[PDB]
Amino acid sequence: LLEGTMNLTGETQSLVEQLTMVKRMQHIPTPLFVLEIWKACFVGLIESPEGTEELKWTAFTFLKIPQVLVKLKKYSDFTEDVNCAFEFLLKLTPLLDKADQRCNCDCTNFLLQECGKQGLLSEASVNNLMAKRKADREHNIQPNIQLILRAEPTVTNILKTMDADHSKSPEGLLGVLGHMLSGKSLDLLLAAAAATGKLKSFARKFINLNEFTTYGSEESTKPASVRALLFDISFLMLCHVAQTYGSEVILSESRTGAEVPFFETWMQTCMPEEGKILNPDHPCFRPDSTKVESLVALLNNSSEMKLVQMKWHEACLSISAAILEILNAWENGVLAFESIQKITDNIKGKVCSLAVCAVAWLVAHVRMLGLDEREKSLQMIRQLAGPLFSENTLQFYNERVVIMNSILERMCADVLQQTATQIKFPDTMPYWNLLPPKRPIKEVLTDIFAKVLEKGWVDSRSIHIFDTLLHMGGVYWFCNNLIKELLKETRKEHTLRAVELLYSIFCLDMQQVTLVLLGHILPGLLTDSSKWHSLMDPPGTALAKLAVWCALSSYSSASTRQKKRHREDIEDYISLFPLDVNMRDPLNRVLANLFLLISSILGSRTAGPHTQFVQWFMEECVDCLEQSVLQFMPFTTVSELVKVSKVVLAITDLSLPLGRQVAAKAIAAL
């Protein structure tokens, strides 16, 4: 459910590695494992909000999850187990009926035919399962699943046909692209391409189309008025991709030569994202003084009448300075409001991407301003994002208006949250602004963790609030408060469930959470003499399990906020852990320090609950391992652990030639 909610566009190999990890940590039978995959997928589909998220969830269950199962089959008698899991699932009639009411069709039929196509299931199994499902079921628009399952081959074939610009026929390109701009067709293609790993090539194709249509050639009005529309369609769909599926699918990741495209630089330096706030007087927003006067004269001329040669990248880069001079003119008073209306109509009318570039600079500039100084510039957005200017539209105007209104919603939303301002473009932002306005943020955390424990699984909305709290209060505060809420449980059942949930919650940034957990929380609980009454057997065994699962999963080795924040972070782990493979990698340093602490606790006097804790930690280090986290164990632990009470030697030693000597010493002298 986490991989469905946060990164649909992630590669399947990382997910297969993580799932095989989880299957090895807690020893999970294969039918129950695949059953939990299907149950999670269907529950997340039912709980999805209506709109793009529902399309994305249908793609994840229908396309990505069947591919993941195929990779598991190669890595691992899988057909018998997946057939068993399908019978396990087909007992659950209320889940499947809720799903069928949301799917508007029987979605289990499409699942069984899809798993038949991938080869997870034999055909006789498929047919008797569909017979059972029809018997249990007995008691004009195509649904989205058929659209997606047929739209993935259109993704491949649209790649292969628009490699060549429809044999350089821009009228054909425009018609097919307008059909894509029609309702929901773009979203269907993007959801299929995201779930099937082909969003990067799709973005490369539209970016290359954009580079081709940037300059243009000697042309009369009719050919150019097609070329500017191609620029608009490619630009608006690229902005919609970058706002929905993240910006890192737009990046080229290696550009040999300086010829980075226009849209990549514009998105890099000029488009607001979630964690990106922009400098309005960055040198990117001040290209020249020469072209910008030509452009303000161009906007004050009339209907451009000169779209026959515009070099649209230069125009779009220059609009920021242009509207800056317009704003200074209006702040002095030398321009009337009625001429402002004329300039905004000349911007937003013929080409809609100009409005997006202007609104991006306006959002940066309004974010920097004070409270009382804002009032004029917001009116500019009200005219740039207003309803349609009419009677000179090129073609496909209403659909570009719809996509543009979505992009401007997601650009302006933060600034229009700072001051209570309604622009009212007409849900498209279903998980946005989730925290209560005044409540301290630990109450939010404890309430959501209480509800996740009492349900037994993590919702999609709960995943989004947990992400915002991890970004807001930081890793240490988050991990410490969740572990406190663990340690005040008193039942065996609730402690084991809380740990099995907290591992997945910590999979937001597993690596940093393990550094905080094994470096700050556990040494503070083991070293403080007042604290270790909290380390009693009911919560203590569960906590030791969570620490060893975190250590193993971090050793063997994910969201965009977490990528940005770890790139922000500076710390000296050599100075933090002085320590009396690389050993400049911080996780090796934390593990070596923790095992020194464990040996020191086992060797000392005053046995209490903390000694029981380090016993349990070493025992699940032994049991959870296949064979290595225990490569960092000091060899004095081999002697001491059976002083404090076989296999806990023979696994922990890692079997070097000197390691046999310590092994044979301990095992013979038990």
């Binding site: 039942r491 065996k492 059942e493 009693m536 057997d537 009911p538 609950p609």
Partner: protein, 195 residues
């Protein structure tokens, strides 16, 4: 448990989870009666007067909600008209003996602050709108429960002051003052003024 026993006892009580799971009416927290004034109380709805918990047979590991004070049931019954004898049969009140039952007192206070909240929502779109009906029923119910000393006046007033402190609940304070006027006008001559 003690740190030396530990798992040895805890897991043992966990193996008595299915037996407790057999002996639990499922959804018992969300089942509500229809309040009839007839008497002859079914003993399913009786609560514990000390702690508002359901009385449970045995010492098993019951489900986590059955150890919580059942305030939803008591608020639903107190919000109904003519639920006077049913609340006494629930909390074991007897009216031959005055007791100052505390959890009843706290539930009545929270009922008052809930009425104050719901009066402060609008109360002006619909003239009846269930608000003034609620305040009339609150007058009658709270008169009976403070009059026979099952709850007490000044602890109720100062706890009510602590709930309304800083919450900023001011649109229907006249109704709350009216209800307090019913108590004072009912029983000023019986008690000292320091109450």
């Amino acid at each position: 448990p003690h740190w030396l026993l530990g798992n040895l006892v805890s897991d043992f009580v966990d193996t008595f989870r299915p037996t407790a799971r057999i002996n639990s009416i499922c959804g018992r927290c969300s089942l509500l009666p229809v309040v009839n004034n007839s008497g002859a109380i079914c003993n399913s709805w009786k609560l514990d007067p000390a702690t508002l918990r359901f009385p449970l047979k045995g010492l098993l590991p019951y489900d986590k909600d059955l150890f919580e004070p059942q305030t939803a049931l008591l608020r639903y019954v107190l919000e109904q008209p003519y639920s006077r004898d049913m609340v006494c049969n629930m909390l074991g009140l007897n009216k031959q003996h005055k007791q100052r039952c505390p959890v009843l007192e706290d539930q009545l206070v929270d009922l008052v602050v809930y009425a104050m909240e719901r009066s402060e929502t609008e109360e002006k779109f619909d003239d009846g709108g269930t608000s003034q009906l609620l305040w009339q029923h609150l007058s009658s119910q709270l008169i009976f429960f403070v009059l026979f000393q099952f709850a007490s006046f000044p602890h109720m007033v100062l706890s009510l002051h602590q709930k309304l402190a800083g919450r900023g609940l001011i649109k229907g304070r006249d109704h709350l003052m009216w209800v307090l006027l019913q108590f004072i006008s009912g029983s000023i001559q019986k008690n000292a003024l320091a109450d």
